[PDB]
């Protein structure tokens, strides 16, 4: 059992070490990842973050012994389109949280290196889930622009209703526009209005 | 990019609104990720062009991030003009010396 | 030897932030 | 009328786990697996052969995602080779 | 002797990472190339510089309100007569100019820009009149 | 903890300034603007947009001097004395400035913009017009403002 | 622990020392601060202290996912216009209070000079807020006289009702003028009366 | 109808804090930050890039002032440089 | 209709204290002060400048008497010189 508390001594130290090493490995590629995850050049024209349209082709569901349901494609929107102020970077997704732990014989050494490898691939699976999450979000926004080009989703309908000078004698606001999103983006089920892309 | 460029053909470029010029064929190599105004003012200040803006600035900042190496200022401002899609627009009047940045009306 | 020209007295930070308050009230008074 | 699929399978068609899961430790093949509520979800590009899957999706690059019951082994076809895959949980 | 680049792609994962970065950058530039609406400069419909020597005075304006008062006293800054043609609506056409050494012809240019669709500016400099037009 | 230095120190700034001035690369520094003046014989050959291989040690110590500050836009411009034409002069000096800033951008500078240009002897520093790239009018010089 | 009460010993002594240094540093510049924060030449004519106007340009509020409100300018009236007898000096705002505290090994010394530096920057934080507060009140009164010149805010209306020889046999007042403010300054929200000031 | 902005942003468009606040310790940039009721206000001339603000104003000299949720790091743009900023609280 | 002034200022126009008071030792110039009930009353030939006086009378020979809130520091103009005086209470 002393091997086991040596292993959990090694686990959080290996996780914090791998978190630090991939933090400066992420910081080495910071302009490259800013070029990769250009969310700023994917927002809509009234500063709307576009929604995340997941795609699944070739879907089957065996409900019981007697009935299946197949569909050829499904498209599901998660994370619906909304007024963003500042567009998201990679660092809200991918930054692993670095603390440096100050919490400290032969089986201690070999189980602490086994725990160090467990902390290293545990932090690697945290990273694998993080680039999985940002690949999901950026691929869904790319797929929103694809299906808007294919006329499968509606664009969002803002309404800037204007107010002029607004308020009493103690507060004025001079050009007071209030902007709403009335229509959220949604998939149209009208099948005949779609666009089918050729190439050459 | 394939499905968007085949469902709408891009009929026009922006070289007819940003033409090349003498002291616009000076070259630059830019990494930049802030707002558009300091970048375009520095491009025009080293281009020896008077920089002016049209439109008041939006309250969300229009952000670009130009990361490229060794090209002239005309295609740098064309990349700035493309990266500011429907938010701002770079025009260059090379009969005078004006680099002008226009925001949008929303 | 390498030297920038104005080597004044040592300022302190009270007079520093008083100066960058005073320039803002100076040019706001000027445009008023 | 049966349900269409699970809508968790578009999340596990990427590598992102379902909300409130437990990861599973896949060994001997490029699959990932999560255990959500008495159901495991594998994300792979192998072909699942033995243990019976209840639902499946497939992305653009031949990644599949399978919803199945919790079996500790998985039989896959790699490239015509029958192989196995241990999970833990 | 020279040196390699400092944060070079000098590594078998990072060459694929930064090759993917330059690929997604130029594909971002061509999707921006297609959905960028441009205007041709012969059909841009904004005001030109009217090149009057009274209009080449370097002015300074910090103001935000209705376009009629700024154009009226920018007209009598330029010693121009000021005509308003059209009806001013109840919600006023609001502009915002904040520059502190700039020519008043280009100030007139970008209030014509900030008017846009709700108003328009004409300058007839031979008769030295400037007309704010509504719609 | 925040960092005291930015990987750089004032002793190494004055050491590289007096060593570059000992090498003949004149480092003027007026206020916050800085100016490194390189004669074109120290970098290129005669009327050529090609570096000599020994000049990359000079560009390595120029980029190690350029690492020491925090800047926004390095501009680098070149002019050489008149050879066959002003158009040949401007194409030669534009290629000379673009090859020296291609190496400086390949090296570590922390500038954001580098403005590379060449003029066709349009700013001569001396009315003596003694030769080609042995002339002190033939120079590439690197100017920036040290930000904060 | 003993280092922690060492730095708490050093903090109040350092902020009192930095308070004394900025006090006679203020008193060195005392006529310059009288010329800078000239509240006396900023009063209105019945010794009304003018109100402080705060300008906020480019205001945006993200209310939810679906609605934002922008305004191009806002003007706010804080600290409304009121009768002062004497004008405010700079010393009501800027003077930090100097007491000299009489409340007293190696880690004591190095933590008490870390505490001395924390007392120095905490006193500089209080000086930065005091310089900010007098900059806010003075730029507010400058913004009052600018928007009064631009006709964005109404001037105050006094009313000197005159009473003659009042009082009974036990007390008289010979010329009893009672002066009131009937109309406070307020921002006029009819927008067409505003005055655009060009220059040359 | 939404609210217009916060009208504490004209106070923090100057350097003066809100009434009843706690100051945060901005390191790594010329900003100040305060914390009034679960919201931090920064007074900057750097531009805020990552962590999302709920409201903003900007003075005549390009000082902005942002109302946001309590984030421990701010990502700013200085002059195209993308820097970070630590707060405490 | 507001009140006229205090009629205690007719007393403290010359040097006599108000009835039921407490004296206040003024240092740094020829001025005297009393404290009647949470307002201090000063008699001086200088003109006080900072702390805000609620009421004032002025004699035939130009001595002033002010009624004011109790401030420990009185700023004065002597003859254009700006001096301070401390009180105790």
Numbering used by the authors:
A (entry chain FC), G (entry chain EC): 58 to 161, 173 to 268
B (entry chain Fd): 56 to 161
C (entry chain Ed): 24 to 55
D (entry chain GH), H (entry chain FH), I (entry chain EH): 273 to 361
E (entry chain FD): 25 to 159
F (entry chain FK): 41 to 188
Task: Recite the paper's sentences.
The Type IV Secretion System (T4SS) is a potent weapon used by some bacteria to infect their host and can deliver effector proteins into eukaryotic cells as well as DNA and/or toxins into bacterial neighbors. In the Gram-negative pathogen L. pneumophila, the Dot/Icm T4SS delivers ~300 effector proteins to the cytoplasm of host cells, in some cases causing Legionnaires’ Disease. The map can be divided into two major regions: an outer membrane cap (OMC) and a hollow periplasmic ring (PR).
The Dot/Icm T4SS is ~400 Å wide and ~165 Å long, consistent in shape and size with T4SS complexes visualized in intact L. pneumophila using cryo-ET. The global resolution of the map without imposed symmetry is 4.6 Å, with the highest resolution regions near its center. The OMC can be further subdivided into two features, a central dome and a flat disk containing 13 arms that extend radially outward. The dome of the T4SS OMC is positioned within the center of the map and is about ~50 Å high and ~100 Å wide. While cryo-ET analysis of the Dot/Icm T4SS in intact cells included a stalk bridging the PR and the inner membrane, this portion of the complex is not observed in the reconstruction of the purified T4SS, likely due to dissociation during purification. An axial section through the map in Figure 1B,D reveals a large cavity running through the T4SS, starting from the bottom of the PR and extending to the OMC region that spans the outer membrane, although there appears to be density in the central cavity closest to the outer membrane. Notably, while the disk exhibits the expected 13-fold symmetry observed previously, the PR contains 18-fold symmetry. As was reported previously for the H. pylori Cag T4SS, while the Lp OMC and PR make physical contact in the lower resolution map with no applied symmetry, the connections are lost in the refined structures due to the symmetry mismatch. The high-resolution structure of the L. pneumophila Dot/Icm T4SS allows us to compare the structural organization shared between the H. pylori Cag T4SS and the L. pneumophila Dot/Icm T4SS.
